[PDB]
Design a protein around this ligand. Structure first.
Ligand SMILES: NC(=O)c1ccc[n+]([C@@H]2O[C@H](COP(=O)([O-])OP(=O)(O)OC[C@H]3O[C@@H](n4cnc5c(N)ncnc54)[C@H](O)[C@@H]3O)[C@@H](O)[C@H]2O)c1
Ligand SMILES: NC(=O)c1ccc[n+]([C@@H]2O[C@H](COP(=O)([O-])OP(=O)(O)OC[C@H]3O[C@@H](n4cnc5c(N)ncnc54)[C@H](O)[C@@H]3O)[C@@H](O)[C@H]2O)c1
Ligand SMILES: NC(=O)c1ccc[n+]([C@@H]2O[C@H](COP(=O)([O-])OP(=O)(O)OC[C@H]3O[C@@H](n4cnc5c(N)ncnc54)[C@H](O)[C@@H]3O)[C@@H](O)[C@H]2O)c1
Ligand SMILES: NC(=O)c1ccc[n+]([C@@H]2O[C@H](COP(=O)([O-])OP(=O)(O)OC[C@H]3O[C@@H](n4cnc5c(N)ncnc54)[C@H](O)[C@@H]3O)[C@@H](O)[C@H]2O)c1
Ligand code: NA
Ligand code: NA
Ligand SMILES: [Zn+2]
Ligand SMILES: [Zn+2]
Ligand SMILES: [Zn+2]
Ligand SMILES: [Zn+2]
Ligand SMILES: [Zn+2]
Ligand SMILES: [Zn+2]
Ligand SMILES: [Zn+2]
Ligand SMILES: [Zn+2]
Lengths: 368, 368, 370, 369
């Protein structure tokens, strides 16, 4: 039979629908993956306003349903994590180790790319539909290129836990460990304790930060922050321009000097320079949200030797980073189980989105 | 109490050649007979700090008189001046960031410091007068702390060449070597080919950059850039907002990809984000001018993984870096002699300042 | 001139509990009332230096008396001691390498004699002769005369001075070897050869830094059980005959799935194992030799082959004023397990037992408390 | 399709070599046939005489594409190519770390034949497959290689002799300074052994901005060459100086009582493998470039204190990244490739080029076709 996969589709007018997408047999370098769990990221919300129809979802874990003619490393029944780098392995950036900004295949930096499965293989209302971030994980079956999958091998695997590795975990963890290269014993400030920020916090704790200050406008998020390793919390005011008041409090909590590292995770474009306010001179400020607007910045915030970086996807190298995360999860340091606040069914995607936006969840996941 | 002919900036935008009353040195201080004093763009800015100052923060000379506790200097020793005057004991000094010393930096801690000679030691209109950047080199005789000098030992020393080490050379060289850590074989864009920018260019050539693209609005400065290492020149539009036309030309010149490194040192506040437009993803953008204003930034310029840094004084560690610069001068790699465009007597400071702003000099020096 | 009960090594191989005359501090000096002193093998070695020594190079205490120039410290201040006593002005100090200070380091610049990091030689007298203090400190004493560069101020209620006293040497060395020297990255794999005072702190530091696998190796199975306390994920009983631990390297590759570890640390004090961490790591891995070896040894140079970084760091690249307060915070946070490292506390008059227990391998760390 | 009889230098596996013909066959889909224009000589080519198996010698070369396999789309007949012996797979753990030079699948050093080598039946001698040295075999009129072995360049009036030595001597010396040591401008550097590799180490320290560059050799002709490539200081070592201990004292003398920031050992002498440690100050960086596969005796005080010691392979070459950077440094005049070509040889005079190498008469010798 022709595969009819129950899916979430964003129509490109601002709204989404639960519906069915027709999914092909894989070409030679593609796989058919049965999704067991799909995580929800803030960017899925933004993806409703892209102005083109897409199968939604770019966090997901599952099992190989069927393999293309030229795939050797994978077979039906294999457990897999999905990544949206889908890197080409030959371009300049891939050879620098920057698989996450692959010049040919990145859905962000190149985009639909050769990291996307063949376009006609996914059909909605009898027409090809794009797969969000080359994946489209809010769907019973996803068609993906081989470079989208990382094979794992775990008994009694919690697939809801595994599904969030794909974005929130990898981005938050990689921003700490790959980009900032946070040193043990140091002080770290996290601005915004949501899907990404709670993983920055977890990763600061894994990395051995001596002080970890969590900042949010929502008191429920601060309490989650403590679960994942924050040593201090600061409730911000929405009216705190550039979080400048928070910066003075950080200096006071640390004894008169700014933090060694700060991470911005708020999804608020106006707060793009806030991590610079938090750090001492020669500190490291990492802006994780990604901002595509003009904003006004007091350039004094850059003064003096502060490193500022806006990294993509935590500098993800999927076949390298995902097994390292899996090992930290199994060891007990990476707290993926506790991060899954609620599981939902695909029909209740709206309630899951609302619980995310309302600040009720660390991470919500759709389970199939 | 000696009378030293000096350039004093009154706190109104104006200066006057006058006499400053200099006292004998305290136990940890020194009287330096200035042989040559370099001119920095910042000396122009210092006219409009609303306080009387003994101008000048670049200089070389000979030790005139030594205080009680000075053990390794004597009358007659050749010395270079530095304005870091580091305390050697605070957190930043112990980090090796002597240039942002939390106690003595005239920039970071002034706003004053123990890096300044005793305030009574320098007087004008019957009042203590401060010495620019703890130095005040545009003066026949300077009173300074020991941490302000670096002893050198040279035969037939060109004091003019030595005088510009104190700021323009250290800042430009250090921004490349200590702050950006530019790798041999890379591509580099330099925006602004002035006293700092020509030393950034020199330092890219010393460092082994494969392509060095010099950018200025003044054709005379581009011809000078070719002397110091530039392999390519771009004449910019004084009305190219954000230098976006220059970015397209860079990508064109480099074969379709942005540069590995870009350095901004135009003294134009609105160009503070410009080096980001010049570099590829994961490139390094260094903002050398130092901007204290609000400016509007297209935050897309930070996407993705670009390192942006605003270093102070090229991360100068004077007793370490100044001898390395002297060796590079002696070796023929650091082209100090070509940088000295004209030598002025103190009474002609105005003409020196005019030639500075008219773009007629790489460096002008005042000679005594 | 105050009289301080002290452990003096006589040089002949013996030591005695005695009293040592300690002057008031000159202007850059200060008198510390030692609360606790850690013990390690170096103190046994200071019995055979062939000159009378005030023993002890690990300690924590309280300022008793301050010299005329000291401004940072006052009577009653809690202090940790460090044996780097850096000068802050030489090339290495300006490089951030205070632990190898060209002027004051008792290891680098102490060539039989003592350095300017030592308090003035006449400030400590035994039998009418001036007496040298071990590593510029002499902490196995009720009152120690030291330079300001030797102490790091801290402020804690209910401070476990015994825990505090071991930061001075083994903790700094093993933690620093991981964090400052190897700069171990979270998620990686690490092998630790030798699980004594240094090695257990290497293991703790790998755990603190977030290694995904931590393989402990020792010839003493009791030490492997301890290694599990401090965070080891896997343990290997090494065979004392195994030359260069070639069998252990094979087992490491098996445990890890076919490739060497990212990092390996050698803490065995066995000269012939100096190159062993090379055998444990993959190509382009990092091999850290913590022991310090001064003998000629024969090395199969294929072990270096191919991009392995090899380093023999001193004192964990300690910058005392920066690193000791960070360690204190990790202790307060619960991550650095100082309390669990203290196997036994001793009286100064018990020093003979504490050295016997140490040489017998009975302790993780022994501490003298006053 | 035909079977080319390629005149070649073959090491027989008995310690000798011969000039002979090797049969080279049609390239498979991911392979290609290269007409060699020039082949450099590296000290390792002489070590390959002792490997105990027949090999087509040579692992430095530059040439033009003679024929492209079915699936090659980025190269055509006539294209200029530099050869590299990393032949990286691009998918293993090391390749994804950026360490294509120690590829776990394809490296002829760390894996080897490998899938970095062209199909084994494609090169034949005495009726049976013959391995190509370092997956290349450049001392031959035509080489059969994998696509991963070539870097396309385009340059009018290219000097192929200068281009041929990028393949090993230049990349190893340059990369050991810039990729491994990460030598910082203004620092002091000591180079032990001024040969094919050491002279490129010296060039790369000059390119990188070292303030002091101290060349050391037992051969006075090499010290004169070293000055051409940027040495500010030269020291004639004695063959009697165990560990180069007296040289170490003179390095400190020359640097005002202090050890150097960086030292590179390039001597091909196994007993000298620890020598760079004695040249450097505490927290200095010592780079052992030769590669030693023997037991030696090391005074372990040489490691004392924070000295980084490292034995890098092939200058950490990522050939598609590094080789274009080297080509640009050559074109702008900083990398002095032309000046490294001391003498050019016919293939039949390969014996003379090997004696000239071992006698120390050349910077680099190349065979031209
Ligand atoms: N760079 C990347 O590769 C990458 C990857 C994933 C997500 N993102 C981006 O990261 C951002 C955050 O993602 P998320 O899933 O964690 O979203 P989220 O909604 O789960 O978390 C946002 C958090 O920021 C808090 N916050 C809002 N305003 C604040 C303020 N003024 N001060 C302090 N805290 C404030 C919110 O309460 C919330 O807890 C999104 O913009 C998303 O697009 C980037
Ligand atoms: N970070 C530090 O420690 C430090 C130290 C010294 C100076 N500075 C700062 O560096 C800046 C430059 O100093 P300087 O002495 O080199 O000044 P300068 O006047 O000598 O040179 C500035 C150059 O920028 C050129 N320029 C102006 N507008 C341009 C444009 N739109 N595009 C391209 N080029 C343009 C000018 O033609 C001139 O050549 C000053 O703002 C100064 O305060 C910083
Ligand atoms: N670099 C520095 O600054 C510094 C500072 C302090 C101590 N050290 C040195 O570190 C070394 C270790 O000191 P320590 O106090 O931990 O000594 P220790 O005796 O307490 O521990 C050494 C451990 O190595 C084990 N071991 C012995 N042989 C072994 C083998 N063949 N294989 C595996 N394990 C073996 C032993 O069982 C013992 O547990 C000493 O040499 C000491 O001199 C160096
Ligand atoms: N790590 C790698 O990837 C790599 C790559 C190429 C070559 N190599 C190795 O590098 C080494 C050098 O190769 P090469 O082609 O430059 O050889 P070479 O023969 O051209 O040069 C060796 C130099 O060392 C000199 N020398 C000999 N003894 C000396 C001594 N006691 N003191 C000082 N100098 C001495 C010689 O006079 C000669 O100039 C070889 O062992 C070779 O196998 C390694
Ligand atoms: Na941890
Ligand atoms: Na250069
Ligand atoms: Zn996402
Ligand atoms: Zn790519
Ligand atoms: Zn200036
Ligand atoms: Zn300071
Ligand atoms: Zn000890
Ligand atoms: Zn020192
Ligand atoms: Zn070679
Ligand atoms: Zn590979």
């Amino acid at each position: 039979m022709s595969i009819q996969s129950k899916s979430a589709v964003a129509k490109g007018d601002g709204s989404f629908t639960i519906t069915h997408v027709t999914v092909a047999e894989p070409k030679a370098d593609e796989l058919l993956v049965k999704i067991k769990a799909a995580g929800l990221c803030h960017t899925d919300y933004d993806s409703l306003s892209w102005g083109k129809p897409i199968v939604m979802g770019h966090e997901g874990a599952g099992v190989v349903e069927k393999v293309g003619s030229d795939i050797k490393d994978l077979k039906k029944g294999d457990q897999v994590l999905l990544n949206w780098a889908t890197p080409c392995m030959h371009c300049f950036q891939c050879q620098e180790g920057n698989q996450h900004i692959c010049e040919n295949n990145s859905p962000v930096v190149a985009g639909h790319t050769p990291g996307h499965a063949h376009l006609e293989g996914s059909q909605w209302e009898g027409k090809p539909i794009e797969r969000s971030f080359n994946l489209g994980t809010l769907s019973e079956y996803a068609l993906v290129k081989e470079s989208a999958v990382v094979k794992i091998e775990e008994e009694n695997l919690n697939f809801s836990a595994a599904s969030i590795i794909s974005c929130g975990v990898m981005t938050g963890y990689g921003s700490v460990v790959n980009s900032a290269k946070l040193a043990a014993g140091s002080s770290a400030v996290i601005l915004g304790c949501g899907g990404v920020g709670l993983n920055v916090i977890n990763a600061c704790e894994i990395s051995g930060a001596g002080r970890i200050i969590a900042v949010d406008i929502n008191p429920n998020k601060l309490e989650l922050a403590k679960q994942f390793g924050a040593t201090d919390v600061i409730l911000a005011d929405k009216t705190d321009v550039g979080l400048a008041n928070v910066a003075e409090q950080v200096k006071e909590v640390l004894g008169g000097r700014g933090a060694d590292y700060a991470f911005e995770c708020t999804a608020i474009p106006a707060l793009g320079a806030a991590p610079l306010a938090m750090v001492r001179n020669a500190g490291t400020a990492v802006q994780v949200s990604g901002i595509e607007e003009d904003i006004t910045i007091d350039m004094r915030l850059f003064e003096w030797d502060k490193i500022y970086i806006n990294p993509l996807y935590g500098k993800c190298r999927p076949q390298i980073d995902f097994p390292k995360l899996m090992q930290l999860y199994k060891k007990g340091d990476l707290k993926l189980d506790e991060m899954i606040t609620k599981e939902y069914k695909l029909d209740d995607l709206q309630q899951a989105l609302d619980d995310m936006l309302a600040g009720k969840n660390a991470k919500g996941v759709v389970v199939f």
